[PDB]
Design a protein around this ligand. Structure first.
Ligand SMILES: CCCn1cnc2c1c(=O)n(C)c(=O)n2C
Length: 203
């Protein structure tokens, strides 16, 4: 509690200078270190931990708005092309083209036995949609089966990502702001830690 307030202030003092940037995004990702060979941190949770997180959120947030989308992402020259998906899971039309620029990244200290937490602030700038002419297979692709639960200023994202045949499970929390420059405050960052720590320690 007392230390949670300190890290919330440390996060805010580092992110404060960036809130004037348009298209800024803030996220807290569950994950773990040294779970695949060539990577340091991997933003994934186990299959059964994903499921236990799901029912927790389904029960404690059953009153909240819930969306559900299947999309097909293509990484190409640093840009991410998002495609809509048909009944078979296959790409149709390109809906958005965005470029992600990491601004600030912080590792959150976590209780022993809980999932690691990664706090990231970045810009996701939309781009010229004519670049969809490259098609949905010009680069590495990820099929994303996302369940989003929006609760106030927080959006929980639970995603099954099929990539090169293997299916991974991802859990993250995003900020839902009308104006992040005015609404992302210390007390918001303190709550983000509270809610992320709850998911990370569900065992
Ligand atoms: C990479 C610089 C060129 N470029 C400028 N804007 C772009 C690109 C691009 O390659 N791709 C794939 C894009 O999607 N956009 C929006």
């Amino acid at each position: 509690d007392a230390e949670q307030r300190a890290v919330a202030k440390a996060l805010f003092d580092a992110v404060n200078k960036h809130l004037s940037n348009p298209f800024i995004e803030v996220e807290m990702r569950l994950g773990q270190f040294k779970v695949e060979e060539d990577a340091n941190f991997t933003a994934c949770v186990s299959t059964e931990d994903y499921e236990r997180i799901k029912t927790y959120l389904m029960t404690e947030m059953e009153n909240s708005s819930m969306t559900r989308s299947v999309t097909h992402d293509v990484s190409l020259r640093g840009w991410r092309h998002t495609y809509a998906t048909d009944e078979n899971g296959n790409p149709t039309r390109c809906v958005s083209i965005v470029r992600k620029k990491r601004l600030f990244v912080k590792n959150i200290v976590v209780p022993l036995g809980a999932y690691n937490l990664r706090f990231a602030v970045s810009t996701e700038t939309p781009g010229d949609l004519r670049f969809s002419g490259a098609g949905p297979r010009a680069g590495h692709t990820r099929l994303k089966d996302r369940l989003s639960i929006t609760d106030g200023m927080f959006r929980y994202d639970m995603t099954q990502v099929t990539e090169k045949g293997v299916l991974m499970h991802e859990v993250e929390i995003e900020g839902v702001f009308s104006s992040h420059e005015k609404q992302l405050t210390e007390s918001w960052l303190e709550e983000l830690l509270r809610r992320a720590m709850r998911l990370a320690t569900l065992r």
